[PDB]
Amino acid sequence: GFEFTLMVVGESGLGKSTLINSLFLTDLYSPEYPSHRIKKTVQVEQSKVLIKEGGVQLLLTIVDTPGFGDAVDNSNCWQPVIDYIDSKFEDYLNAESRVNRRQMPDNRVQCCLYFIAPSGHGLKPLDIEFMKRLHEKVNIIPLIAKADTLTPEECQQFKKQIMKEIQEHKIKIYEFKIKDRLPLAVVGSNTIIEVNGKRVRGRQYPWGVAEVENGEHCDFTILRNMLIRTHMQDLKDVTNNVHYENYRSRKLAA
Amino acid sequence: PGFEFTLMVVGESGLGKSTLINSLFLTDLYSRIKKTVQVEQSKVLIKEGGVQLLLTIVDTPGFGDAVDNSNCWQPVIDYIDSKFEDYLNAESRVNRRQMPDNRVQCCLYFIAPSGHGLKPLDIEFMKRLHEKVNIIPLIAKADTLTPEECQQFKKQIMKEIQEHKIKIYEFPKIKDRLPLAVVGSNTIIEVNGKRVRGRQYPWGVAEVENGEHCDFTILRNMLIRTHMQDLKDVTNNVHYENYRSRKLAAV
Numbered sequence A: 001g002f003e004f005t006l007m008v009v010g011e012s013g014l015g016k017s018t019l020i021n022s023l024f025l026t027d028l029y030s031p032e033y034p035s036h037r038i039k040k041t042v043q044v045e046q047s048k049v050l051i052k053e054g055g056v057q058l059l060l061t062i063v064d065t066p067g068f069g070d071a072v073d074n075s076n077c078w079q080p081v082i083d084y085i086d087s088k089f090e091d092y093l094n095a096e097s098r099v100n101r102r103q104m105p106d107n108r109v110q111c112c113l114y115f116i117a118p119s120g121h122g123l124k125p126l127d128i129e130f131m132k133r134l135h136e137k138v139n140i141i142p143l144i145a146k147a148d149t150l151t152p153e154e155c156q157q158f159k160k161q162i163m164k165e166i167q168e169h170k171i172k173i174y175e176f177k178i179k180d181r182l183p184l185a186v187v188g189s190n191t192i193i194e195v196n197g198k199r200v201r202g203r204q205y206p207w208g209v210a211e212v213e214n215g216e217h218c219d220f221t222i223l224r225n226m227l228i229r230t231h232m233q234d235l236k237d238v239t240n241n242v243h244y245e246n247y248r249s250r251k252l253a254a
Numbered sequence B: 001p002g003f004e005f006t007l008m009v010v011g012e013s014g015l016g017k018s019t020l021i022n023s024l025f026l027t028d029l030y031s032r033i034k035k036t037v038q039v040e041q042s043k044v045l046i047k048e049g050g051v052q053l054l055l056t057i058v059d060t061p062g063f064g065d066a067v068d069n070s071n072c073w074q075p076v077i078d079y080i081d082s083k084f085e086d087y088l089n090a091e092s093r094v095n096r097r098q099m100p101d102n103r104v105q106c107c108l109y110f111i112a113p114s115g116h117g118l119k120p121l122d123i124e125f126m127k128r129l130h131e132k133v134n135i136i137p138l139i140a141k142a143d144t145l146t147p148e149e150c151q152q153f154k155k156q157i158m159k160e161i162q163e164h165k166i167k168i169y170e171f172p173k174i175k176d177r178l179p180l181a182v183v184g185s186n187t188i189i190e191v192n193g194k195r196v197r198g199r200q201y202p203w204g205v206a207e208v209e210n211g212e213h214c215d216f217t218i219l220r221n222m223l224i225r226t227h228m229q230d231l232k233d234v235t236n237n238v239h240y241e242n243y244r245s246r247k248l249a250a251v
């Protein structure tokens, strides 16, 4: 087998559930059921996705954070995400410090997808604060959400502006060309529609169909391929040898 | 004689607000530190033939854009109520001949096309301003939504407006398709022989003036055509008078 812990962060309604379902071919999320307005906070939610393909089975933990960025006042909304991540480091540090450390559960967060709203301008203040405060605790993959809302020229200018701001703020996102088109701009959909004679997943508008697996429409295929067993391993290795060790060295030095 | 009108625009940055205003006049008229809502205004004078339309556009840059948006409605309230206060003081003078009218007569509130419902900040703003100004809610960047999603999202929004007893502007016919879902662009693309304004994607063009694609043409006909007067009348006869009564009763 093989295990992996993926965290999802972003405002409500940025296509996060649809993208997760699109990457892993799941139907993991329930509809919004009724009944209005009670102040929102970031709540950590875990799903276990056990995907069996005949022996090569993947055990995937999806850590969602509904409420992030959704209140009128989003002050310190990163803090519950820090608390969850750092608590997993602490659990690991305590487990490996035991005299009899045979068992060893590993729940450290190995990747964080951060969804950027496709405004077409730049990063929001909350985007900068979240990434600047988490980039040394977890592997951040920033994503331009709902990328079918950008024309190609708008998308290109928006990618460039975002990368300009990540550099200006000395933000260290996860690094593996693919770097030429960061951040990845994704479209998600499990809806099948026939475009020409081929059935493909994508989003049906009156004027045409944005295709999830068309590399000229979005970077979904790049992202899915980046999240397979071999590239998951490097995400695990950096979590362990960089983020965990940095946390461990900091706590022990005190 | 001409004609004057004061239009306020409110919403998060990057919702196509400047673009939509440009589209309404077929011309491109626009476009780690904490930022506050500033209220700003500029004038747009349209002179066609012998008649002038003098439009004041009141913008609110910074609205809904910060990490902490607490009380970001207050600078909008302060501005609107101060125009009521100016009008009250001007018509109370013994000599009231010259009579400025800067009261805000319409407020376009742009809703991000999430596909779910209203955000808490949307409820707060509308609930706190709906008796001070004519609010027209607008689904921004409506090419973000499939038709099914758009219909679902409109119905969800209207349920919540009713739930929070919000009173949006009563248009005096296409009342079942609220809120209006708009698309903005002055870019010209040739589609199937006819040249139209729209947004070019690799898979097709969303057309600003095509009514099966969005509700821009409905918004344009309401605002541009002199349904402006009805918005004026409601501003003076209801919003202003409600203000005025409240101020005077406390004397």
Ligand SMILES: Nc1nc2c(ncn2[C@@H]2O[C@H](COP(=O)(O)OP(=O)(O)O)[C@@H](O)[C@H]2O)c(=O)[nH]1
Pocket (backbone or CB within 6 Å): A011, A012, A013, A014, A015, A016, A017, A018, A019, A145, A146, A147, A148, A149, A186, A187, A188, A189, A203, B114, B115, B116, B144, B145, B149
């Ligand atoms: N334009 C666009 N809409 C999307 C995309 N993915 C999902 N949606 C729609 O966005 C709405 C919210 O999607 P959801 O997955 O629940 O987003 P979440 O709240 O962040 O989990 C739904 O109506 C989806 O059909 C996308 O890639 N582009």
Ligand SMILES: Nc1nc2c(ncn2[C@@H]2O[C@H](COP(=O)(O)OP(=O)(O)O)[C@@H](O)[C@H]2O)c(=O)[nH]1
Pocket (backbone or CB within 6 Å): A119, A120, A121, A149, A150, A154, B012, B013, B014, B015, B016, B017, B018, B019, B020, B031, B140, B141, B142, B143, B144, B182, B183, B184, B185, B199
């Ligand atoms: N998808 C979509 N994008 C739009 C629309 N109108 C404008 N945009 C794009 O959204 C980005 C921001 O538009 P802008 O008018 O500056 O929004 P503002 O900040 O609210 O004024 C620009 O790249 C526009 O081209 C629309 O109706 N749909």
Ligand SMILES: [Mg+2]
Pocket (backbone or CB within 6 Å): A016, A017, A018, A029
């Ligand atoms: Mg979801």
Ligand SMILES: [Mg+2]
Pocket (backbone or CB within 6 Å): B017, B018, B019, B031
């Ligand atoms: Mg603007």
